[PDB]
Amino acid sequence: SMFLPPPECPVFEPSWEEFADPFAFIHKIRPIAEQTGICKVRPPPDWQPPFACDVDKLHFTPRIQRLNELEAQTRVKDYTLRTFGEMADAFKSDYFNMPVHMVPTELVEKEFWRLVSTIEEDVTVEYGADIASKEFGSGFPVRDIKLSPEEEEYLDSGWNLNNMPVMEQSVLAHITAICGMKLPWLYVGMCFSSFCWHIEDHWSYSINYLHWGEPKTWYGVPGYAAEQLENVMKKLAPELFVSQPDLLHQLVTIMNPNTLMTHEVPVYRTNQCAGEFVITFPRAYHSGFNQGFNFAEAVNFCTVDWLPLGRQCVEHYRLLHRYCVFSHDEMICKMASKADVLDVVVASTVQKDMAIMIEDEKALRETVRKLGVIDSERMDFELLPDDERQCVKCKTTCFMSAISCSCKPGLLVCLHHVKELCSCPPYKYKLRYRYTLDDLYPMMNALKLRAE
Numbered sequence: 001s002m003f004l005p006p007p008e009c010p011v012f013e014p015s016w017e018e019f020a021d022p023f024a025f026i027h028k029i030r031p032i033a034e035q036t037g038i039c040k041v042r043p044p045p046d047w048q049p050p051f052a053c054d055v056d057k058l059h060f061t062p063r064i065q066r067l068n069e070l071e072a073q074t075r076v077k078d079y080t081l082r083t084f085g086e087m088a089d090a091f092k093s094d095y096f097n098m099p100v101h102m103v104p105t106e107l108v109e110k111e112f113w114r115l116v117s118t119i120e121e122d123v124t125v126e127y128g129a130d131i132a133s134k135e136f137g138s139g140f141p142v143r144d145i146k147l148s149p150e151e152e153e154y155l156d157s158g159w160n161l162n163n164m165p166v167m168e169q170s171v172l173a174h175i176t177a178i179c180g181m182k183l184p185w186l187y188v189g190m191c192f193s194s195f196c197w198h199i200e201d202h203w204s205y206s207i208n209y210l211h212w213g214e215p216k217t218w219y220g221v222p223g224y225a226a227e228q229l230e231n232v233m234k235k236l237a238p239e240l241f242v243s244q245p246d247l248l249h250q251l252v253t254i255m256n257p258n259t260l261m262t263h264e265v266p267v268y269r270t271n272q273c274a275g276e277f278v279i280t281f282p283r284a285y286h287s288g289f290n291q292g293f294n295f296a297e298a299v300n301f302c303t304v305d306w307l308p309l310g311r312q313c314v315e316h317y318r319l320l321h322r323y324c325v326f327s328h329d330e331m332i333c334k335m336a337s338k339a340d341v342l343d344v345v346v347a348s349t350v351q352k353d354m355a356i357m358i359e360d361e362k363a364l365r366e367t368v369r370k371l372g373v374i375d376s377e378r379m380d381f382e383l384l385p386d387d388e389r390q391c392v393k394c395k396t397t398c399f400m401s402a403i404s405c406s407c408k409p410g411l412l413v414c415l416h417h418v419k420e421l422c423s424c425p426p427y428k429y430k431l432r433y434r435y436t437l438d439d440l441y442p443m444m445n446a447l448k449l450r451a452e
C-alpha cells in the first residue's frame with residue numbers, strides 16, 4: 001500500500017586484502033551483484049580518504065528539475081557549495097517542518113514516490129552535475145599545491161575514482177579519442193533531486209562514491225532484465241522512445257519501482273551513506289534520489305568481463321540507430337596494436353573479441369563484394385572526427401570499413417547499410433577499409449604470444 005520498498009541489494013564489506021585490488025574484488029562479487037544490477041561496497045573502516053574543499057570558492061551552475069513520474073527529462077546538459085547547501089537545508093527543513101537529521105529515510109522515500117505521482121504537486125528542485133574542472137575539481141586527492149601525508153596515501157588508490165580509468169585491468173584507458181565518458185562526474189544533491197532510469201553508455205560499469213552528506217537512495221535492475229524494463233516503459237511512456245538527433249538528447253524518466261515489480265521486473269534498493277560505494281553492472285538500469293544535501297563522485301569503467309557486452313551493445317545501438325560514444329573496434333585494434341604492454345589476461349580477452357570481430361568482418365566484406373562493390377581503398381578512419389564517419393542510416397561510428405560514393409561526397413554507410421547510401425549502381429561505390437586480413441594477423445599473433 002502506498003509504497004513497498006524493493007528488497008535490499010547486496011552489501012559487501014571487503015577486508016583490506018580483498019579491498020586492495022578493485023578489479024579483482026569486483027570480479028569476485030560479480031556472480032552475486034550481476035543478479036541484482038547494483039551493489040554497495042563498504043570500504044574497510046580506516047580507509048578514510050580526506051575530503052577537503054572551500055565551500056565558498058567552489059561555484060557551479062545548477063540544473064533545475066521538475067518531479068513528475070513518467071515525464072520526459074533530458075539526460076545531460078549560479079551557486080557556491082555553501083549557498084547551495086543553505087538553499088538545500090532550508091528546503092528540506094521547510095518541507096517537513098523538521099530538522100534535516102530527524103527526517104527518517106523511509107519517510108523521504110515514501111514522500112518522494114507520493115509527490116512524483118501527484119499531478120497537482122509541482123515541486124521543483126535543483127542539483128549540480130558536471131565533470132571535474134578547475135572551477136570545481138575531484139573530491140579525491142589529485143596531483144598538483146602540496147598534499148598532506150594522508151592525501152598522498154590515497155593518491156594512488158584503485159578506489160580513487162580518478163585512477164579507476166587508467167588502471168591495468170581496465171579497458172577504456174588507452175582509448176584516447178571521450179572526456180565526457182571516463183573523467184569523473186561530480187554531483188551536488190539536495191532533498192528529492194533525482195537521477196532518472198538509465199543504463200551507462202556502451203553498457204559500461206559505473207562506480208559512485210558518496211563523499212559526504214545525507215544518503216543517496218538507489219534502485220537497480222539486473223542486466224538480464226533490461227529489455228523487460230524497456231518493454232514496461234515503452235507501454236507506459238512511448239514518448240521516451242521516439243528517435244533523437246544525438247546523444248545530448250537522450251530522454252529519460254522517473255518511474256516507481258513498484259510499477260516495474262508489478263510487471264515482473266526484479267528491482268533492488270539501497271541507501272548509500274557517506275563513505276560508501278555503489279557499483280552498477282553492465283546494462284543494469286538504475287535510478288534514485290538524494291535524501292538531502294550531499295556530494296558524490298562517479299565514473300564509468302570497463303573490465304575484461306565487459307568486452308563481449310560492449311560489442312553486443314554497439315550492435316544494439318545499430319538496430320536502434322543510436323549514436324556511439326566511441327568505436328568499439330577502434331578500441332580493440334588500439335589495444336591489439338599495443339599487445340606487448342598489455343596485461344596478460346587483458347591480452348587473452350582482447351584476442352577473443354578480435355577473433356569475433358574478424359570473422360564478422362570477413363562475412364560483411366564478402367557480402368558487399370557480392371553486391372558488386374569492387375573498387376576499394378585503405379582509409380585511416382581514426383583520423384576522422386566522429387561526425388564525419390557515422391553511417392548515414394544507423395549512425396554507427398565506422399572504423400573497420402564503410403562504403404562511399406563519388407555521388408555523395410563525405411557520406412558513409414556501414415556495410416550493413418550498403419543499399420542506403422544513394423541511387424547509383426554499386427560499381428560507383430568504394431569500400432573504404434582500415435585493415436586487410438594480412439594487417440590483422442600480426443596483431444592477433446602478438447596478442448596470442450602476449451597471452452601465452
Ligand SMILES: O[C@H]1CCN(Cc2nc(-c3ccccc3)no2)C1
Nearest residue numbers: 358361362365366369435436437440
Ligand atoms: O571476397 C571479396 C570480398 C572480401 N574479400 C577480401 C576480404 N577482406 C577480408 C577482411 C576481413 C577482416 C578484416 C580485414 C579484411 N575478408 O575478405 C574479397
Ligand SMILES: [Cl-]
Nearest residue numbers: 115116118121
Ligand atoms: Cl508531481
Ligand SMILES: [Mn+2]
Nearest residue numbers: 198199200206
Ligand atoms: Mn548511472
Ligand SMILES: [Zn+2]
Nearest residue numbers: 391394414417
Ligand atoms: Zn549502418
Ligand SMILES: [Zn+2]
Nearest residue numbers: 405407422424
Ligand atoms: Zn551515388
